[PDB]
Amino acid sequence: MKDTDSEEEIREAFRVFDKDGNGYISAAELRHVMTNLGEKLTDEEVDEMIREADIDGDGQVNYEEFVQMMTAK
Template identity: 30%
Template sequence: MFDQSQIQEFKEAFTIMDQNRDGFIDKGDLRDTFAALGRINVKNEELEAMVKEAPGAINFTVFLTMFGEKLKGTDPEETILHAFKVFDTEGKGFVKADFIKEKLMTQADRFSEEEIKQMFAAFPPDVCGNLDYRNLCYVITHGEEKD
């Protein structure tokens, strides 16, 4: 499912999230991880929902399996790129962030305001309000930014 370098990256992520170093990720670990990322007021229900996605206690094997299942449903990079290109009528490699926000919040599987904030926190528009969708597509499908 994953190559050795990907497994190592997941192991590092697991180790960071396992805040109390007991070999399992639980609600307390998730709360501490969110706090380390600057999100202090995470609702207990949200943490419970995350933990309930697992079939049992979340050790590294379960963590890796869950990511495999989540990533399996990701469209290929080219498919996602073509979806954004529809909005890039001038072929510049970017679209206006406000335009994408409006489309994501009003069409099909609508994004919430919180999901929009999370997306723009991870992929902030440039000073002109443009979203580099090529880099966004790469990160969605490969998990890290191009150099």
Template identity: 50%
Template sequence: MDSEIRELFRIFDKNHDNTISSNELGKVLKCMGIEMPDQDIHMYMEELDKEGNGRIEYREFHTFMQEELKKVEDPEHQEQTVRSAFRVFDKQSEGLIGLTELKSAMKNLGEPLTDLELDDMITMVKINDEDKIDYEEFIKVWLQRNPNEKD
């Protein structure tokens, strides 16, 4: 799980300063299915920012993510997390996600899939002419694969 948390930190640290800003934290929370107004994000930021420097260092992020990932053992929460991650990639709100984006999203969730697992799941869903997948259909396949698994 540590390598996944480090990769997630790297993905959301857009300016590569080895910290997460409140703007970047908002994106992390949204990806995790936690929607909140900017004011609440700032309050959350203050809680996570143990050093009080206005930024979240990796060790602060790591502690936070370990706590949040424990919550994703609940299948309903897992589904919400996957939906939220897909929405990040669905810029036109079409309900579609490209194969490249899908692979990226699935590798950065609490339970990353191997390339073989992902390829097996992709064969079970329709891919349109633009190499896009209906992510509602993919979520159904994903949930069938994970009915009672725990992290």
């Protein structure tokens, strides 16, 4: 309780995008919550927004990969 950012702050923000509670956030999970405010990411925009969120698997995001896209960016 002093000088800290709560490592949990991201533990939840992660599921905020991972609604399938499977462990990895799919592209639809990123375009579904990213538009919860109005933004409408298109397909060529989601796959590209994912390529930077994940490290280099196939095109999915995870908790350790979502952490970098959560705080920074």
